[PDB]
Amino acid sequence: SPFSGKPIQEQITNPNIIVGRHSYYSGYYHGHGFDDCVRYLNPERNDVDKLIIGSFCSVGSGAVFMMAGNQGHRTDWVSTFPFFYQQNPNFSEAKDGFVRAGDTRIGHDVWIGSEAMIMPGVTIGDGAIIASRAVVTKDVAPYEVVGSNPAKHIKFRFSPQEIEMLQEMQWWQWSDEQLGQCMALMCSADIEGLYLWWKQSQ
Amino acid sequence: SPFSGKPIQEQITNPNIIVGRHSYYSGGFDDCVRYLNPERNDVDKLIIGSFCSVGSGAVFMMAGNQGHRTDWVSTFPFFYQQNPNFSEAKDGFVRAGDTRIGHDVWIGSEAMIMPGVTIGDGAIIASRAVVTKDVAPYEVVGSNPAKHIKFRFSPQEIEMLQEMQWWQWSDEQLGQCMALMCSADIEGLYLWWKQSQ
Amino acid sequence: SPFSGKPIQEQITNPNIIVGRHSYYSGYHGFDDCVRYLNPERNDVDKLIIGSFCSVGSGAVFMMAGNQGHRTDWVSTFPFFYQQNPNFSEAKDGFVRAGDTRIGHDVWIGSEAMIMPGVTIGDGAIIASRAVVTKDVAPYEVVGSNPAKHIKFRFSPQEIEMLQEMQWWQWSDEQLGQCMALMCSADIEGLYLWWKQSQ
Ligand SMILES: [Cl-]
DSSP states (O other): OTTTOEEHHHHOOOTTEEEOTTOEETTTTSTTGGGGGEESOOSSOSSSOOEEEOTTOEEOTTOEEEOSTTTTOOTTSSOOSOGGGSOOGGGTTOOOOOOOOOOEEEOTTOEEOTTOEEOTTOEEOTTOEEOTTOEEOSOBOTTEEEETTTTEEEEESSOHHHHHHHHHHOGGGSOHHHHHHTHHHHTSSOHHHHHHHHHHHO | OOSSOSBGGGSOOOTTEEEOTTOEEEOOGGGGEESOOTTOSSSOOEEEOTTOEEETTOEEEOSTTTTOOTTSSOOSOGGGSOOGGGTTOOOOOOOOOOEEEOTTOEEOTTOEEOTTOEEOTTOEEOTTOEEOSOBOTTEEEETTTTEEEEESSOHHHHHHHHHHOGGGSOHHHHHHTHHHHTSSOHHHHHHHHHHHO | OTTTOEETGGGOOOTTEEEOTTOEETTOOOGGGGEESOOTTOSSSOOEEEOTTOEEOTTOEEEOSTTTTOOTTSSOOSOGGGSOOGGGTTOOOOOOOOOOEEEOSSOEEOTTOEEOTTOEEOTTOEEOTTOEEOSOBOTTEEEETTTTEEEEESSOHHHHHHHHHHOGGGSOHHHHHHTHHHHTSSOHHHHHHHHHHHO
């Protein structure tokens, strides 16, 4: 169930969600599946922040991606109440307090723990791990492990040289057949071996 | 849909939930309120000021300690079993007091408000905050347990807002100063209010 | 219904969940929705073991299935082994067991706490609402936050040693009835003397 889930690309119909190959969601049997993860994302506008998810990601049950930016609430105005979005004739002069946050971008090979919450506009680099229940309020670096609320640095998965090797080779770009030829290396800690294998194919 | 939605006043049936005008929930709202008995007038109530914005999946914890006494041998509420063997159990329930959310409060998505907490006017509760203690007027808090982040305005601006209490004005009066309401010009709104008195 | 909820022993069918008497869940979607990723058809997986007289708040989560096949130390965390893809046939199984999750007796789990895999929580512990318990919790310890951290102990070390001797959760409901005035009190020393006289 958490090992396989169901692939996200089949579950979504919102054009503002873009997801790469093989990425899956393990909360598939709850509610409406992956769609329930995605909060406040307008499907009928092309001028809103989108949710971009790389290939080969694993999203844990109940993860939340917060979209719609500041939801019309301006902390710096007298009131956070979104007057502009009330159908009230008295409030017709209200100014739009909506502020976009930018796209939410999740890299390739990202593992998002169960019930983590990703705040608007955050970028999570390739290979990162988001602990269960983390509240990610800032960008996460490639291969970084973070947790807590607000999420904070725990560690990196690999050495800086291994990270550079992974950033050069971009194994998620290879075909499944090419990944199948080097599956013994993919399922190992031998980053150096996989880098050498990739160079010999170039 | 987080910009508006169903106003809370129209979608509650629990007499122990009292909510001011225009406050809305972007999720219904009854599912936010945990363990609140709708048939008893001797329990902690949930009081919500006007012009509040409540994010999806926020939780307001009611029913106090739920009968669990951390100072007793066991936290198991023997008193609340129908078991004849426990007939002499002592009631462990301890009320927390009303939960009181002020006017113009923004409660982030999936924040949890613990029992008996007061959240002052104009406060902002970050998404996923766990609010275990009172929050001051115009204070921003986050994390678990929630901690101080910042104040939205200076002490003198807060005092101006506490004197003018714009949420008490009619929607018609608010429309007349809407350019100011949608600005950081708190002194301008204050001078505007004084000219109307 | 936070005060008595409904008993867990009667609302479970997953044989990998083992729960003591009187323990109840106050979000009755029932208690089984609290248990995440637990395979009910295998006997070689981590089990969920819950003592008697526990109180589990609404929406608590018990994370099972260990690392769910994700090896942080491998090139990728993507569980190639669990994809039915013919190209990934030589994939190695990344699953690592965490060990059983063990909740002691007389444990209060706050609403929407999450218990990570392999964790042991001692008798008498209190888990604050929304705590994320990433490591073992000691008997009669109170923890909270994310990750959970020590707050206090409910009783002194001498009182805790007394409670670990007498193990009142082992007594019958009838015996507990005979000392209910002491059970509903802070008089640990009094309950210990009562127990000594009953032996
Ligand atoms: Cl948290």
